[PDB]
Structure formats: C-alpha cells, structure tokens
Design a protein around this ligand. Structure first.
Ligand code: SF4
Ligand code: SF4
Ligand code: SF4
Ligand code: SF4
Ligand code: FES
Ligand code: CL
Ligand code: CL
Ligand code: MG
Ligand code: MG
Length: 582
C-alpha cells in the first residue's frame, strides 16, 4: 500500500495513478491546461500542473505517478511562482481582450490568469490580425492570436479521427497549428467534425459563423425564415444557460426561436423521420435486389468526407436518402410552399446543429434544386445560445411552446438520431415492419446502443438473418476497415458516425470544462434525453408520424419511388478535385 502526504494530509491508497488524477479524485485542487484526453503536450509541456515533490523538486502532476512516501505540496510559493511564470509567458503571445471574445464566459485560460494573477511581460497587441486569422473553411475558423500552442486540438484530432488533419506547422520559423501545408481545411483530408474546436481551451478554434446569414434573412421583409433544430440541441443547449447537464429544454427552445423572430418553427427530427422513410425503404429494396451490400448510412457529413477522402470505392454503397438536415431542407422548398402559398424563393431555411460539418454539407454546390438551396444557413448549438443571449431572452425562465406541426411532428425513432446507433435503431424499426408487413411491438434494439466503438448485431427480417454494425467515431471506421473486420462476414447495413458518442458529441456543441468531463459522462447524459423522449412518445416509428404521412400522401407519394426518389435522394461520386465554384 502507498502512503502519500499531500498538503499535510496523509493518504493510504493502492491506486497506481498520477498525482493529478489522485488529487482530482480526492477533491485536492491542481490546475491543468494542456492535459486532455489522457495526453499532455509532450513537446512543450505547459507545466501548469506543477507540484512540489519534496526531495525530488518540481514535477508535472499530470504525468507523474504517485509513489509510496511521496510528500507533495501543490501550493508552495515555489510552485505558484513557476505556474504564474508559465501563464505570463502565454500572455506574451495571447491577445488578451475578453470583452468581445466568443469564449469569454467559459475560457480556461482566462480562469487561469485570474487564479494566478498572471501578467504579461509585454502585452500582445497585434495591430493587424488578418495574417493570424483563417476563415477560408465552410466549417472551421482559426484565430492564432488566441492560440496557446497547447496541442490539445492536434491530440484530439489524432485520437478522434486518426486523420491527423490538424498539425503543428513551421511557418516562417514560428510554430502554428493548422491544416496540411497551411491549406484550407476543406481541401485536405479533414472531416470538418470540429473535435479540435471542442478540445480548445480558448477562442483560437471556432465554427465558421452563419449568424450574419440568419440575421440578414430575419430582417429582410420578404424572407420567410424557417428554423429547425437537430435532435441533440434540445439535450445540450441548456448547459450554456446555467441549467446543468442532461436537461430536456425542447419547449423552451421553441419559445426562444419565436422570440428571435423566426417565421416558422419546425424540427429536424421530422427530417430524420423522412430519412428513415426513404432509407428503411431502400434497405428493403436492397434485400429484394441482393444489394448492393453493405448499405452504409449517409446522414453524417463527417463520415461522407471520410469516405470521399479515404474510401471512395464505398460511395456507391451509401444510402441515397438525404440526411435529416438536407432532406428536410429539400421538402422546405417544395412541399412547404405547396401547403402555405409561400413563394419558394422567399423561403429561407435555417437549421440548428450540434455539428460544424453540417455547414459544409449545407453549402455543397449540388444541394439545391431550381436555384433554391436545400438549406440556407446552419448555426451551431453555440451560435444559437449566443443569439438568444444577445436578444436578452430569459431562456431558463421561458414557458414551453410547441413546434408548428406540418414539418415539426416527430416520432421516437427520429428523436434518437443524435445518439450513436440511433439511425440504425430507427431504420430497423421501420425496415422490419415494412419487410414483414407488420406492426411489431418489440422495437428496442439495445444491442446497437452505447459507447463501444464498434457494435454489431444479427437482426431477423422476414425470417432471414442480416448482419448490421454501428461504427461509433471516425477512428473506429479506420479500425473497422484497416483491421479487415469488414471482411469477416457479409454486412448488410452499417451506421457510421464521425464523432464518438454520435451527434450529441458533435463539434458545434457547448464546450465542457475538463474538470466537468471528469465528473459527467457527457455522451451518455446528453443521449439520455433523446432516449427518454423516445420512451415517452406515442409514435416510436418514423412511418407513424402523422404529419409525415400526410406529406407523403398529399405530395411525395411513396418513399423510394416517384417524386420522393427524384428529389429526396443524393448520390456521391468520386471525381477530380475542383473549387466548389465549378
Ligand atoms: S481566449 Fe480567453 S483569455 Fe483569450 S481573449 Fe478570449 S476569453 Fe480572454
Ligand atoms: S475538424 Fe475533425 S478531422 Fe478536421 S482537424 Fe478538426 S478534429 Fe481533425
Ligand atoms: S488551437 Fe486551441 S487547442 Fe489547438 S494548440 Fe491552439 S489553443 Fe491549443
Ligand atoms: S457524428 Fe453528427 S455531429 Fe459528428 S460529424 Fe457526424 S453529423 Fe456531425
Ligand atoms: S497540464 Fe501537465 S504539463 Fe500541461
Ligand atoms: Cl404548421
Ligand atoms: Cl443531432
Ligand atoms: Mg505525456
Ligand atoms: Mg423577418
């Protein structure tokens, strides 16, 4: 047994762990910065986690194991001086102007500067930020005047995607982070998943803003602005309004969106039910046609980019159904005018997404018809929160309201899209009913749920056994393919999400402090809201959505045929690179 003494207090433990972990486990305060995802910045350690081990000297707590008889002071004058000195050095390369900053309310660096009363040896005040800023991407932005070179983004990219699209670069003899060859991220193997943003302690990495698109549309007299939120937003955005984790704020969002002046309140969960209508039908068609198997989901634009960039031979195997976002958008410019009298060109469709890659998806040149974009703007969960706060809307105090039903109703199947395994489960509910011409009672596919990276199941459909898999995170797609798992059996239907946990852990989601991530399983807690909705909804199958059924009966016809097939689908092709202008 190890006996260790920390700030005078004796501890008896068998644990083999770091000083930082043990201290955090035992409510002892130790600061940290570059340590995240069980890695610190091995080159250029930040040393913010410095503690004193009597007899040894100053050590970095985040990668120093506890040892029997250690006497540790986390708070000696020597320790605080070192840490304060490290923060001072960072201030020397940091434009410290928190007033207008988009991380002002939850910046890890600001909190450290305050805690240690750090001051720059010389304030960093660049007169021209243009050379520090990269806004070329459809999804990501970089502001290097904020960058601490902590490496958290580089490490998070590697672990979450294994693309290493985010790199340390030598630019004119000075270190920066950025994409390969300092290119626009979009032009590299990057998935635009934004996991790098989520890992950033400061405002250096952000989403490409669509807030001006939205505000200009809202203010244009002739525009009719639709807004529709993704499943995950209602399980997440309350975090930014002091409501804590795992709170369902669906009704509040609807009210807030009306107060922001949006002209129609719909819901992307309605779009998810549409995706299932088409994709479940397509699965049943492929069963009839002996393929092409496997069918892959196509609702995650991070995964679509991964396939385009690494596995172009799989593109024809993707489901042709548009994603919940784009399929909704398509309907919003066609069906919705048909039931409203609106001039289609005056409809402006806005989504709220937990995702940065959705911005790239919405701006794909061919995601339009007759000159009308499926989706005109995509704002992240974070962007919506800022919009609500700017408008002085008292979010946490709002009464609940309802969505406009025509493209706002949703089933429990659509509701769970935000969790890894969600589209798989939702699809199977409809596909098995369709194939067996039945209304089955047993609809919960718990085998495809949860945080395991690769999840498989055998599903009986119309008295044959089919093999399905759920790939949970872009790194696990690479594992699945590179390890040859893909060739161990015939797979028939495979879900792929780029973000581990699914969209509840997307790149547009609220940041979470590393200390809170230690206490809260954010992927599980956000997803729980969605599964809870599913359990409590009367309709738990996409094809039982009454507003959806009306829409097909009155406008689209039958899924996978006719008008539905013509405009609610999208196929990806391998082709020579071009600027999107072409
Ligand atoms: S990144 Fe943090 S410390 Fe820097 S200006 Fe923004 S809020 Fe202030
Ligand atoms: S968006 Fe995703 S793939 Fe691209 S650099 Fe960031 S973490 Fe890596
Ligand atoms: S962009 Fe953010 S996470 Fe990446 S090195 Fe800079 S401060 Fe760290
Ligand atoms: S898993 Fe969801 S949030 Fe992540 S890239 Fe895919 S669609 Fe976006
Ligand atoms: S947090 Fe330990 S070296 Fe950075
Ligand atoms: Cl309506
Ligand atoms: Cl979602
Ligand atoms: Mg290390
Ligand atoms: Mg208006």
């Amino acid at each position: 047994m190890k006996t260790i003494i920390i700030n005078g207090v004796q501890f008896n433990t068998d644990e083999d762990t770091t000083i930082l972990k043990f201290a955090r486990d035992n409510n002892i305060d130790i600061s940290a910065l570059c340590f995240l995802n069980n890695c610190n910045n091995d080159i250029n350690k930040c040393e913010i986690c410095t503690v004193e081990v009597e007899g040894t000297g100053l050590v970095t707590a985040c990668d120093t194991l506890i040892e029997d008889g250690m006497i540790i002071n986390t708070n000696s004058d020597a320790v605080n001086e070192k840490i304060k000195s490290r923060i001072s050095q960072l201030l020397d390369i940091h434009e410290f102007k928190c007033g207008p900053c988009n991380r002002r309310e939850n910046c890890e660096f600001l909190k450290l500067v305050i805690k240690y009363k750090a001051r720059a040896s010389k304030p960093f005040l660049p007169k021209d930020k243009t050379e520090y800023v990269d806004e070329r991407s459809k999804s990501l932005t970089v502001d290097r005047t904020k960058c601490l070179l902590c490496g958290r983004c580089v490490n998070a990219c590697g672990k979450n995607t294994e693309t290493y699209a985010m790199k340390f670069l030598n630019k004119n003899g000075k270190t920066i982070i950025g994409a390969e060859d300092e290119k626009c991220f979009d032009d590299t193997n990057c998935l635009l998943c934004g996991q790098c943003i989520i890992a950033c302690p400061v405002a250096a990495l952000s989403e490409k803003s669509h807030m001006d698109r939205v505000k200009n549309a809202l203010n244009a007299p002739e525009k009719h602005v639709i807004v529709a939120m993704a499943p995950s937003v209602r399980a997440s955005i309350g975090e930014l309004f002091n409501m804590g984790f795992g709170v369902d704020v669906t009704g509040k969002i609807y009210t807030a969106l009306r107060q922001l002046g949006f002209d129609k309140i719909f819901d992307i969960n309605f779009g998810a039910d549409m995706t299932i209508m088409e994709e479940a039908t397509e699965l049943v068609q492929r069963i009839e046609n002996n393929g092409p198997f496997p069918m892959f989901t196509s609702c995650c634009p991070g995964w679509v980019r991964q396939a385009e960039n690494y596995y172009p031979e799989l593109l024809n195997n993707l489901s042709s159904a548009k994603s919940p976002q784009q399929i909704f958008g398509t309907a919003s410019k066609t069906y919705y005018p048909s039931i409203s009298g609106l001039d289609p060109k005056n409809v402006f469709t806005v989504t709220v997404m937990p995702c940065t890659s959705k911005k790239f998806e919405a701006d794909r040149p061919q995601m339009e018809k007759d000159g009308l974009r499926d989706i005109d703007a995509v704002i992240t969960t974070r962007e919506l929160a800022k919009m609500i706060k700017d408008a002085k809307i008292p979010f946490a105090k709002l009464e609940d309201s309802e969505a406009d039903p025509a493209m706002g109703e949703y089933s429990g199947a659509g509701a769970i899209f935000g969790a890894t395994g969600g589209v798989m489960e939702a699809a199977l509910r409809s596909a098995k009913d369709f194939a067996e011409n039945a209304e089955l009672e047993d609809i919960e596919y718990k085998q495809v749920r949860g945080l395991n990276g690769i999840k498989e199941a055998e599903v009986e459909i119309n008295n044959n056994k089919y093999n399905v898999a759920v790939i949970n995170g872009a790194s696990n797609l690479f594992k699945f393919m590179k390890s040859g798992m893909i060739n161990e059996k015939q797979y028939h239907f495979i879900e792929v999400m780029a973000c581990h946990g699914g969209c509840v852990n997307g790149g547009g989601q609220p940041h979470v402090n590393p200390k809170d991530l230690e206490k809260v399983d954010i992927k599980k807690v956000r997803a729980s809201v969605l599964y809870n909705q599913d359990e409590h909804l009367s309709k738990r199958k996409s094809h039982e959505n009454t507003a959806l059924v009306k829409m097909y009966q009155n406008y689209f016809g039958k899924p996978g045929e006719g008008r539905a097939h013509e405009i609610l689908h999208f196929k990806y092709k391998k082709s020579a690179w071009s600027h999107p202008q072409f």
